[PDB]
Design a protein around this nucleic acid. Structure first.
Lengths: 50, 61, 106, 147, 123, 196, 170
RNA sequence: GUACGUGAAAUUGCUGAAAGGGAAGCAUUGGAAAUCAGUCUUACCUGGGUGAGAUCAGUAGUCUCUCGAGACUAUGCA
RNA sequence: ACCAUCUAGUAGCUGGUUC
RNA sequence: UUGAGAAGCUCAGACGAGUAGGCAGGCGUGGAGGUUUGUGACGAAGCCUUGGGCGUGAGCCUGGGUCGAACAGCCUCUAGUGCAGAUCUUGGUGGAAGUAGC
RNA sequence: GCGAAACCACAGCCUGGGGGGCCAGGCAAAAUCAGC
């Protein structure tokens, strides 16, 4: 009974992952774009020079 | 000034804002309690511009 | 301004203390007109406060407030022993409080 | 060069600096903190009186054994002296303080001394670094009536 | 269970405020001449086992979820069955691209990433 | 039962060390105490009792720059102000802020002539002292040690009384009119059954 | 609908099962009382009946402007002022769902609502203003019988310097 | 910018805000100012109708494994 | 007198001996 | 009923200063084998911080700035492995002071 | 005009009581110079 308990709990936990990542994929959400230290130290350098 | 509430997207805003006599539409886009970018669209089909604000200063400073 | 004042004037007296050890988590309050530790059983449980006036204004006004209640009588002279949600600052000795008459049981 | 002052904008300001100046550090400072915050052309009329012993500069911080004068009470300070070598160096700088707005094309008769700095130097005595900021006085436009 | 702390001010080695050679990390004094060792009243306190916190609400953030360093995209996967007792803290040296892919997947597992906002400005 | 923002304690007939202890607590309580006729305070013990107890205090000065020693103040007001200075933690920030709430003066200045003058029933001489005892009056005492302003205040206070007496008869004649008008209002006598 | 997930943190069987609540003896239905905190503090009102915890009180709305409110029985000072007859008023119309708030309920806003804003002015419904005239009409003659009672209600309560609430009687 | 990779502490000057009646230093409890974090963003759950198909077909084929277990390609989507 | 080398001459002892 | 890392889980009581001393468990630093389908020019290590988090603590994790090529967790092996002090060694910098003085 | 160095736990008011610091008191205003 211990082992079958796990499988049913990892079925509740894998269905909640697909029932969420499908709704999550259908919403419109912002774009996580990376910052870059080489190109934000260049801007700050050329700003005050310009 | 109309603060964006809840689930609405920019493309649905522009068509919903042109019908009430609006011309352009700015969007201040902060992150982590600093404003970093600014986009303005042109209604209802005009060119949309994505600048990024930098070296920000208020009026008190 | 005599059609107001639904509280009782009081004065914060001191912290709870011994000679050398003071216990700022519980205060001493002297209610007006309460001059016996048997006449202080009427003000047991009332919700007292401490109203003051800060300089910088937040939420359209300036008055702030620290709530709290009254727990025990204290001594033979009608003082009580109060307890506030934030402990009262030690620079408020001899100030004035308000002992609001609720929760009223009379 | 990266300077220590938030002012000295490109708009109405100009800067000069002087590094590795073989003077004392505790002597140009009290000069520097006296000339600070003043107008430019007045500072010239000010310091030349120091060169002819017509005005003494107070010694506030490094007041070691400075004898009392009669004119130190113009600012309230008890002790003052007439250093001549350090103020000779400041005149050299303030010429460059002029001649930099003279090349940037500013307005010269609204020009104040905004930020004078005196630092130490790599010891060989007690040499000095100096940087100076001269700026226009940032005038104010009268407000438009009502709305 | 509401999290609680027996102490909030950390311990601070004796006279590590006056001298700049002496660091602030705690070091038990070793001399019996000491005022502190004999525990004179008025002097600073000491780390003891008395200030140990609850054995169930230990290691927990004030929210209630314990932390977990996820340094790549398959370290947040283990937190699939533990999304209500662990918060996926991303490690510091992870690049600002490999970071933006942990967030988009931890969000599917309902896992709280504590510092998902680093290096990631959204548009 | 008083939390006035300002109290005026007329001090004729009080004891010094018992009023200075009643007052010292009300200062720390937050009030603003004015003690008028401080010159007519009393002290247990006969005339020479505190006299050598204060002539001894004159023999006590520093032995370095004797203009830096103890300042033995001679006024009847500062005699009692001294008494409320050791009763308070005057070396803290709460002592020296309490002491500026106390204004101890002699006679009655006109800013307090026209106000109420409460007394302390726990420090009075006719209560706390056995009848037929030895007692000395401070303002009569400190004159013999240097307070050279006795003959003026005794003259000044005599003028204030007869003026205040003239104030009283006009006030006494005022309520004799309302004494008639109180019973003349008929509602008082049939509706006194609410105790009044 | 789902198999229970991790950590069966099932509560134990709680022995706490509240029984009838019982108010004071001074809070009889129809007893004039004093109101201590809120907005209508100081205004003396009259109780209609006792609810489970709160009271269902009203000032006669013509006399004071106090509508039919609920007041927690602790922020009311009971008073031995002379009583009235509340047998004519049907207080059983009021229940714990009568004074329930109007259910925000999130009616569909047609998300464009971000731009266009409206307001129902949350006006008191026609039922509330109607019964306010009704219950007052069947108690105003009752307090008209007791002298000094119509003008007792409209005044307020305010203790004064020179008074001390414990030794005074209510 | 050759006083040159990163550039700590002591230490020095300027600027900003404070504090300072012949001692600061620290510990405890709180006021005032400044500022920071918290998922709260929204999510959740429940019927009908409309369309999509697949693990459905009173269905036809391929391959790898072991009758059927997965991966598929059709065709319908009852 | 000085210079190296054995020498890392000599403690019963004086100071110091690191989470 | 799943709580079998049996080196785990669980129930109940008493107890709690500590010197010389005895015992035990851990924290951290440089290198070595194994391991993380390990992190890294979209910025590794370091450094600074009026930011947040954990541990009783030694310590660790992290946001921001700086910066520019390497680096870490886990299990073992190994030691030139931890500093407040020695009129400690070397280096740097102060008050005395622009005083003593030329 | 040039310009040290010794020295440097932190320091700096008095009285009494167990010394600069403790207890209780007297008191207490910046910033400096010359005798001492």
């Amino acid at each position: 009974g211990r082992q079958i308990h796990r499988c049913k709990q990892r079925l509740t936990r894998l269905t909640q992952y697909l029932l969420k990542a499908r709704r999550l994929a259908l919403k419109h959400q912002p774009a996580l774009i990376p910052i870059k230290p080489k190109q934000a130290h260049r801007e700050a350098s050329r700003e005050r020079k310009a | 000034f109309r603060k964006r509430t809840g689930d609405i997207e920019v493309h649905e805003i522009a068509e919903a804002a042109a019908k009430r006599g609006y011309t352009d539409l700015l969007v201040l886009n902060e992150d982590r309690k600093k404003t970093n970018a600014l986009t303005l669209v042109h209604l209802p089909n005009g060119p949309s511009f994505y600048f990024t604000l930098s070296n920000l200063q208020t009026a008190k400073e | 301004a005599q059609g107001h004042r639904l509280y009782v004037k009081a004065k914060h007296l001191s912290f709870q203390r011994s000679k050398h050890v003071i216990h700022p988590g519980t205060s001493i309050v002297k209610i007006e007109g309460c001059d016996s530790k048997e006449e202080a059983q009427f003000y047991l449980g009332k919700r007292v406060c401490y109203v003051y006036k800060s300089s910088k204004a937040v939420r359209g006004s300036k008055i702030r407030v620290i709530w709290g209640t009254i727990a025990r009588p204290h001594g033979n002279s009608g003082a009580v022993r109060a307890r506030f949600v934030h402990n009262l600052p030690a620079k408020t000795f001899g100030s004035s409080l308000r002992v609001m008459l609720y929760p009223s049981n009379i | 060069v990266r300077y220590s002052a938030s002012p000295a904008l490109e708009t109405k300001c100009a800067k000069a600096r002087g590094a590795y100046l073989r003077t004392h550090f505790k002597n140009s400072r009290e000069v520097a903190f006296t000339i600070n915050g003043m107008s430019l052309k007045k500072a010239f009329i000010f310091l030349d009186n120091v060169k002819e012993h017509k005005q003494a500069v107070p010694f506030r911080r490094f007041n070691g054994g400075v004898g009392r004068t009669a004119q130190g009470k113009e600012f309230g300070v008890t002790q003052a002296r007439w250093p001549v070598k350090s103020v000779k160096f400041f005149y050299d700088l303030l010429k460059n303080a002029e001649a930099n707005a003279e090349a940037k094309g500013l307005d010269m008769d609204k020009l104040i001394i905004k930020h004078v700095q005196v630092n130490a130097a790599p010891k060989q005595s007690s040499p000095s670094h100096i940087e100076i900021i001269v700026a226009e006085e940032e005038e104010a436009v009268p407000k438009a009536n009502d709305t | 269970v509401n999290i609680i702390k027996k102490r909030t001010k950390p311990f601070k080695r004796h006279q590590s405020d006056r001298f700049k050679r002496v660091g602030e990390s705690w070091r038990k004094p070793r001399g019996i001449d000491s005022c502190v060792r004999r525990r004179f009243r008025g002097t600073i306190s000491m780390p003891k086992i008395g200030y140990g916190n609850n054995k169930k609400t230990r290691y927990c953030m004030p929210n209630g979820l314990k932390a977990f360093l996820v340094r790549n995209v398959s370290d947040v996967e283990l937190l699939l069955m533990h999304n209500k007792t662990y918060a996926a803290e991303i490690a510091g040296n992870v690049s600002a691209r490999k970071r933006v892919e942990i967030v988009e997947k931890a969000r599917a597992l309902g896992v709280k990433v504590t510092n998902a906002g680093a290096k990631v400005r959204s548009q | 039962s008083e939390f006035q923002k300002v109290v005026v304690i007329d001090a004729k007939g009080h004891l010094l060390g018992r009023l200075a202890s009643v007052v010292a607590k009300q200062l720390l309580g937050g009030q603003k105490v004015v003690v008028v006729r401080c010159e007519e305070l009393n002290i247990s013990g006969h005339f020479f009792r505190n006299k050598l107890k204060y002539l001894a205090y004159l023999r006590k000065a520093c032995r370095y720059n004797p203009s830096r020693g103890a300042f033995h103040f001679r006024a009847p007001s500062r005699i009692f102000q001294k008494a409320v200075r050791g009763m308070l933690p005057h070396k803290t920030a709460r002592g020296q802020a309490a002491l500026e709430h106390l204004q101890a003066v002699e006679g009655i200045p006109p800013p307090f002539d026209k106000q109420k003058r409460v007394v302390v029933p726990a420090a009075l001489r006719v209560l706390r002292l056995k009848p037929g005892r030895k007692y000395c009056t401070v303002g009569r005492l400190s004159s013999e040690v240097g307070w050279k302003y006795n003959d003026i205040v005794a003259k000044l206070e005599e003028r204030r009384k007869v003026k205040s007496a003239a104030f009283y008869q006009a006030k006494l004649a005022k309520q004799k009119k309302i004494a008639s008008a109180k019973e003349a209002s008929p509602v008082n006598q049939k509706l006194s059954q609410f105790g009044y | 609908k789902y198999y229970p997930a991790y950590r069966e943190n099932v509560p134990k069987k709680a022995r706490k099962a509240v029984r009838p609540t019982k108010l004071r003896a001074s809070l009889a239905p129809g007893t004039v009382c004093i109101l201590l905190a809120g907005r209508f503090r100081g205004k003396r009102v009259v109780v209609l009946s006792q609810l489970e915890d709160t009271l269902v009180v009203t000032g006669p709305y013509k006399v004071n402007g106090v509508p039919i409110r609920r007041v927690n029985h602790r922020y009311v000072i009971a008073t031995s002022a002379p009583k009235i007859d509340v047998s004519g008023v049907s207080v059983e119309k009021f229940t714990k769902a009568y004074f329930a708030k109007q259910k925000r309920s999130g009616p569909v806003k047609k998300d464009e609502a971000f731009f266009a804003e409206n307001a129902p002015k949350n006006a008191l419904p026609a039922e509330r203003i109607a019964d306010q005239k009704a219950v007052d009409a069947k108690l105003l003659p009752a307090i008209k019988a007791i002298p000094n009672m119509k003008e007792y209600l409209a005044a307020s309560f305010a203790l004064s310097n020179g008074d001390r609430p414990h030794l005074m009687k209510f």
